[PDB]
Subunit: 289 residues, 3 copies
């Protein structure tokens, strides 16, 4: 009940139990996830004078001098690493046909790496899937940019053959708008939520400091129960706490292990694990050393 | 004036003076109190493996295994202790016909122990006054349950002779709704406030972390002056501070002594004192040791 | 863009750059400033038993015993000190016809001292420009009060020859309403903002703990970009952060130097610098020693 006696943060064990409980008494109810750099943390010339630390990922700076981003770009492309237990929890949920969507701020493609269908993945912060012109918005295949990152140090920078403006991989920089699919799908899942109270929105592993993504939790219908799994209460869970909010100060991997145990899917999960600040600011941080 | 220059927290002395001031220039104006475990703190086999700490006070857990709550229940019933100075401040206010209501989350019956009329007491979290069935809601006299807590260790648990479901004392557990009188009376006092700005709502001794009780302060009419006497600014006083909010980082007993002194009721108060997290979580805490 | 990817606090360098950027792409767009004791900090019998620390600046206490305020009043009048670099930044902005208004809680007249036109200055907390009666509101020249502060220790206190009530300098005390010009002008600048999104509201050097001034930031039109330059995120920037808020944890003087550098006005600024809690609580603090 939304007016039944309850506690805000509570102990991890009770919170995880209440979540599983909610799912058990609400089968055929999908879950929407909203995740950040924290679900990939459990998996881990150089720098040459920048005006400010985040300039490499600033559309304005890039527009005037792309040499620094080009210099670091080679190290950014997604490798073929192993998804965390949490990422696999997303796959597990899909198998049980109970995963409505995953909204991610990460550009490591680890959710896709884990087997999550593209239809259920929303890369709010872009991806390397393609390149685009920062001028007209024209799209190009990944090769165009990846190509230049092989030609000696550099002869020149890829440019739009229609407007002349610079071209870069489709990862959203500070100063750019996010892809249409983001706001458009959220609007769709948003009304979906409104239609159904049996759904859940689980926000995990993000300090909710990057906008507009950080506005998603406050827009969750006040009638839909929201969960936060983060080492600290952040964003809207801190500023505008709701009687039904469930906060779990736990690591995403442990959280995944405990939720699976409570749902009684340990076997299906173990099978999957067997057979099969935000990332940009983190990188910016490492640069400054 | 609600637009006169003022300070949020201010010094204890000025805050207490402003409160007395408000009462002196607003006689025939009752006060509503909202209190927690903090007004009884100034007055102070065992445990056997629980899934989570708060399970003993969780309606769900109880529903499947009441043995642990039965084991601790004997130690919970209200003894005949001495009410704190703050509790007596409530009695003092009643005598002066200036106490509209006391909303309490405590189950120690200390406000009633101090002489506060039942009509002015709202035990939002229940009491041992009676027992009820967690199934149909049927009510039974205290004896039914207290009886079983005398029969050897235990032969079986009290059950509803109409639905068969478990019976327990009327103290609200996590997962249960609060008694009708709570929301119903708050609605009444709420409109009462709306009708009158001469009233005051003083919230004392609670971290405002237990819901729905923790929603009372935000629902106080924005036009009614609210006071918080707590060692820390919490809940809505922290999240949505109002220009007229008065915060007093003081202990409830000291606060009572100082307010009485400022009002000039030391004698009536001394006469009364002469002649005559929340509690559940606190207990849960002690269990874990 | 208000929906373009962005960070809340960000690094000082990027924040200052974005502000200058906003101004460069928004010329003919004035700026409104809201400032506190923090822009004058970079420039630096006795006490005789008070009920509470802030009593000297409390209209109620003053009404019953003005002797303490009279005793300290002599030390309060504005001297002819040198305005800080930040104050001169205000003058600089005026010269560039890009300063719409300065709302200040300070009573040191340093903004006027720096050359800011009175038309653009709003002393929300009063000034020594004149005296007034705390009874009828009658105004008197500064001399009336300053006069008594020369007559031996004291023979009596200045009083209103129309209502008999006490007269004092026009600096707003705790318990008094602010001058009409404050709310009236804010209403004017408020609609002005609504009319224009090219303006900016920069809040600098205040913990936003004194009301009603502390209500200005939340009333800034949600469609107008607001900046906070303070060593700590406070007030509405903390409680109700907005996607477009820009926070700069920097000292006001450094902030001024950096903004000027980014705008490219170093010369005009250097020329000006060449040729040419809140203050009341701070004083109250020093009293207690
Ligand atoms: Cl569906
Ligand atoms: Cl009444
Ligand atoms: Cl104008
Ligand atoms: Zn183009
Ligand atoms: Zn029953
Ligand atoms: Zn007068």
């Amino acid at each position: 009940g939304m007016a039944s006696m309850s506690v805000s943060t509570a102990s991890t064990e009770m919170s995880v139990r209440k979540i599983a409980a909610h799912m058990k008494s609400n089968p055929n109810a999908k879950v929407i996830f909203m995740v950040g750099a924290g679900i990939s943390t459990s998996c881990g010339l150089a720098r040459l004078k920048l005006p400010y630390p985040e300039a490499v990922f600033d559309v304005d700076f890039f527009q005037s001098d792309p040499l620094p981003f080009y210099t670091l770009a080679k190290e950014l492309y997604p490798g073929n690493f192993r998804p965390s237990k949490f990422h696999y929890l997303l796959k597990l949920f899909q198998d049980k046909d109970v995963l409505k969507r995953v909204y991610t701020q990460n550009i490591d493609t680890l959710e896709r790496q884990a087997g999550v269908k593209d239809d259920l993945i929303i890369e709010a912060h872009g991806s390397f899937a393609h390149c685009h012109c920062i001028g007209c918005g024209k799209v190009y295949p990944p090769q165009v940019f990846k190509s230049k990152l092989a030609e000696h140090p550099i002869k020149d920078f890829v440019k739009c053959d229609v407007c002349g403006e610079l071209v870069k991989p489709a990862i959203v920089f500070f100063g750019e708008d996010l892809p249409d699919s983001f706001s458009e799908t959220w609007l769709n899942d948003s009304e979906w939520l409104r239609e159904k109270q049996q759904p859940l929105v689980i926000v995990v592993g993000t300090s909710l400091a990057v906008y507009p993504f950080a506005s998603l939790p406050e827009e969750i219908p006040r009638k839909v129960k929201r969960v936060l799994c983060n080492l600290e209460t952040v964003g809207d869970f801190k500023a505008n706490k709701r009687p039904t909010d469930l906060i779990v100060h736990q690591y995403s991997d442990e959280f995944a292990e405990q939720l699976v145990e409570e749902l009684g899917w340990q076997e299906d999960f173990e099978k999957i694990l067997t057979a099969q600040k935000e990332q940009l600011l983190e990188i910016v941080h490492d640069l400054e050393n």
